[PDB]
């Protein structure tokens, strides 16, 4: 891909984070804490899952960013509508305002309804995410494997401003404590 030139500087929005997340001072890294992180509750926070949004909102143009997933066993990444549900149970699907992929139990899947099996030969340590707002496209790239395509959502019906979307996953196993990190340009 030749998408690097639409690079955008993404930062995480503390106010949207699940109350167990720890966001770094520079707002570029997030990880699961061992406990509640001593913040007040609000209507923006994701309640059920270890999710957080980027601060940036996109309503036009082409945007690209990269995320480090090194040594994580579980995570979700992509974009979502600014108006997605925050409280209670929900599935990650375009019908609910999410355009995502994930790792879970040694398999990679795209957040379609129902979910779609991904074919990745080289387990990625960094993922590139490309959004073309006007074209209705969200694409995912394997930076570890020379930028190879992972998945393209096309004919997307965004239906509002988009925000970068992150899930660090639970850490029941003790093997998923590693952070998600926004990689430098
Ligand atoms: N202070 C902590 O408890 N951390 C932070 C660093 N961290 C980690 C990072 C990379 C990796 F590959 C594996 C684990 C574990 C959680």
Swiss-Prot record:
Induction: Up-regulated by IFN. It is found in: Cytoplasm; Cytoplasmic vesicle, Autophagosome; Nucleus; Cytoplasm, P-body. Autoubiquitinated; does not lead to its proteasomal degradation. Deubiquitinated by USP4; leading to its stabilization. Autoubiquitinated. Disulfide bonds: none annotated. Residues 8-185 form the B30.2/SPRY domain. Homotrimer. Component of a SCF(SKP2)-like complex containing CUL1, SKP1, TRIM21 and SKP2. Interacts with CALR, CUL1, FBXW11, HSPA5, IKBKB, IRF3, SKP1 and VCP. Interacts with SKP2; the interaction with SKP2 does not depend on an intact F-box domain. Interacts (via N-terminus and C-terminus) with DCP2 (via N-terminus and C-terminus). Interacts (via C-terminus) with IRF8 (via C-terminus). Interacts with ULK1, BECN1 and with ATG8 family members, including GABARAP, GABARAPL1, GABARAPL2 and MAP1LC3C/LC3C. Interacts with TRIM21 and SQSTM1/sequestosome 1. Interacts with IRF3. Belongs to the TRIM/RBCC family. E3 ubiquitin-protein ligase whose activity is dependent on E2 enzymes, UBE2D1, UBE2D2, UBE2E1 and UBE2E2. Forms a ubiquitin ligase complex in cooperation with the E2 UBE2D2 that is used not only for the ubiquitination of USP4 and IKBKB but also for its self-ubiquitination. Component of cullin-RING-based SCF (SKP1-CUL1-F-box protein) E3 ubiquitin-protein ligase complexes such as SCF(SKP2)-like complexes. A TRIM21-containing SCF(SKP2)-like complex is shown to mediate ubiquitination of CDKN1B ('Thr-187' phosphorylated-form), thereby promoting its degradation by the proteasome. The coiled-coil is necessary for the cytoplasmic localization. This is E3 ubiquitin-protein ligase TRIM21. It comes from Mus musculus (Mouse). The gene is Trim21. The chain holds residues 291 to 468 of 470 of the full protein.
């Amino acid at each position: 891909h030749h998408h690097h030139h639409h690079m955008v500087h993404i930062t995480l929005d503390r106010n949207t984070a699940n109350s167990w997340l720890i966001i770094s001072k520079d707002r570029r890294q997030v990880r699961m804490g061992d406990t509640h992180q001593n913040v007040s509750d609000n209507k923006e926070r994701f309640s059920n899952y270890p999710m957080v949004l980027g601060a940036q909102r996109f309503s036009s143009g082409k945007m690209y960013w990269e995320v480090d997933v090194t040594q994580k066993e579980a995570w979700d990444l992509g974009v979502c509508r600014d108006s997605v549900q925050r409280k209670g149970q929900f599935s990650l699907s375009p019908e609910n305002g999410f355009w995502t992929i994930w790792l879970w139990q040694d398999s990679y899947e795209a957040g379609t309804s129902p979910q779609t099996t991904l074919h990745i030969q080289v387990p990625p340590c960094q993922i590139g995410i490309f959004v073309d707002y006007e074209a209705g496209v969200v694409s995912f790239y394997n930076i570890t494997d020379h930028g190879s395509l992972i998945y393209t959502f096309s004919e997307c019906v965004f239906a509002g401003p988009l925000r970068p979307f992150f899930n660090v996953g639970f850490n029941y196993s003790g093997g998923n404590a590693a952070p998600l990190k926004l990689c430098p340009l």
